[PDB]
């Protein structure tokens, strides 16, 4: 059921004093979208995914990895023009 090509863009705000994050991320529980936001490529972030904090890494093409709790996933995609 998960197809990022059909997912609406997140609500975001790019802080003007730091570089613009290159990725959108999308968080699902049992393939239902829970929320979404932005993050840097080739980087890392700590995010509460359901009950647990997860250290999520991003590669240069916004593919995200991390040890997600059962039923949960976070997926990335390159923003327009990046």
């Amino acid at each position: 059921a998960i197809d990022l090509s059909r997912e609406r863009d997140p609500n975001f705000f790019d802080n003007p004093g730091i570089p613009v994050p290159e990725c959108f991320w999308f968080m699902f529980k049992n393939n239902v979208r829970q929320d979404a936001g932005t993050c840097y490529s080739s980087w890392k972030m700590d995010m509460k995914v359901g009950p647990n904090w997860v250290h999520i890494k991003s590669d240069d093409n916004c593919n995200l990895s991390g040890d997600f709790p059962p039923g949960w996933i976070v997926l990335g995609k390159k923003r327009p023009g990046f």
Partner: protein
Amino acid sequence: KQKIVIKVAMNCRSKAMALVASTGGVDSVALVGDLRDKIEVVGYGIDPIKLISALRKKVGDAELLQVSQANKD
């Protein structure tokens, strides 16, 4: 710079935004998220634990969702 994302229970939006924005070291605050119920705060020397406690004490329930202590450069 740090980036902190906090979910707040929802005139709680404006009160939460004002409280966060008044915090020392804040560069920006923005309402984000699919339900517009998260505050994304960018700044320096912000203590997220104290920030969450202040929100809980003065505004309403709040949950820490995301922390980076340093943005990519």
